[PDB]
Design an enzyme around this catalytic site. Structure first.
Site, short mmCIF file in Angstrom:
data_model
loop_
_atom_site.label_atom_id
_atom_site.label_comp_id
_atom_site.label_asym_id
_atom_site.label_seq_id
_atom_site.Cartn_x
_atom_site.Cartn_y
_atom_site.Cartn_z
N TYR B 128 0.80 -1.22 0.00
CA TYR B 128 0.00 0.00 0.00
C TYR B 128 0.84 1.28 0.00
O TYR B 128 0.31 2.35 -0.31
CB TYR B 128 -0.97 0.02 1.18
CG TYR B 128 -0.32 -0.06 2.54
CD1 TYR B 128 0.23 1.07 3.14
CD2 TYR B 128 -0.27 -1.26 3.24
CE1 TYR B 128 0.83 1.00 4.41
CE2 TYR B 128 0.33 -1.33 4.49
CZ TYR B 128 0.87 -0.20 5.07
OH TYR B 128 1.45 -0.29 6.32
MN LIG Z 1 2.52 2.58 7.67
#
Ligand SMILES: [Mn+2]
Ligand SMILES: [Mn+2]
Lengths: 180, 178
Positions: B128
């Site tokens: 991410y």
């Molecule tokens: Mn993080």
């Protein structure tokens, strides 16, 4: 008092993480100079949303925004999304010219997605680049892990403290990860 | 030859600036190790789009993709968005395990947004985190202007990614304290 090198720092709260399903419910800004000294703290705005939008939140978001009091602030708020965007723009224009500052903070790609969808005029006021402290965190994790671990992340429960901790994180990396 | 510390670098071309309304027309990848040494160059893929999409591009994209040759390459391509996604994943799987590498490049929030909409299996292959070289570019411009001038900066996709890697190497050597 405009200066093309001043930095706009932002923090958002949302009903959820998907701009197609979710909306912004709180926003805050801080303007610093190029060297991270605070110039002005912006308005912290709870953005009104109707009840069906509030009830449409999942379990984690209904609990977290309820317990923090943001849900009641949103319910009572008389400030619309567009009015909050205008209120923030009127503040930022006193300090930063258009298209000069990147969006600064942490996890700001997600912020940019929500601004693009819900506050496109504010989104367009930024430079298209992001200044995301987590890029420095990732590089430090790989190339100087001691610098990442020596950062003391303070309290970020409220919006201005949240932004200030992102500024302090960048300041930490400038002092200990950046050669000057 | 998978290594969870290896880095996926990516560069896209698009028909416009709107990740939801525009589409991807070119993609390329390069894998480096965590110290920015190049391990393998991925495929450079022009992605077919209907003629009305090409005709509908704004003035900037019409001129730029016209004179780069990409517009003609898009017309002539028989590779769909899904096939290009699958080709790139087949390359990346040999070098990086799923969820390990950040998306790496210049202003790659834009690229991740397009991948999320149009190639979500590939978007989901990244960690991410974003590794955004242009965050350092902006910091160097304000804190060390001499370091931004020291770096001399390419319309070919692999040249573009190589220059993003070289830009990060420049900051690592002259801007970051190790
Ligand atoms: Mn993080
Ligand atoms: Mn440049």
């Amino acid at each position: 008092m405009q200066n093309p090198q001043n930095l706009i720092w932002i923090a958002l709260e949302m009903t959820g993480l998907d701009p197609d399903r979710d909306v912004i419910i709180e926003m805050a800004t801080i303007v610093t100079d190029s060297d991270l000294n605070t110039l002005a703290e912006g308005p912290v705005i709870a953005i009104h949303q109707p009840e069906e939008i509030l009830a449409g939140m999942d379990e984690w978001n209904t609990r977290q925004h309820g317990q923090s009091g943001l849900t009641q602030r949103v319910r009572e708020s008389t400030v619309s999304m567009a009015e909050a965007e205008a209120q923030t723009l009127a503040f930022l224009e006193q300090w930063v010219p258009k298209r000069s500052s990147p969006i600064c903070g942490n996890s700001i790609c997600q912020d940019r997605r929500f601004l693009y969808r819900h506050m496109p005029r504010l989104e367009g006021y930024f430079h298209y680049r992001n200044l995301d402290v987590s890029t420095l965190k990732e590089l430090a994790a790989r190339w100087a892990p001691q610098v990442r671990e020596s950062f003391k992340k303070g309290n970020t429960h409220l919006a201005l403290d949240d932004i200030r901790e992102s500024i302090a994180e960048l300041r930490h990396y400038r002092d200990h990860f950046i050669k000057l």
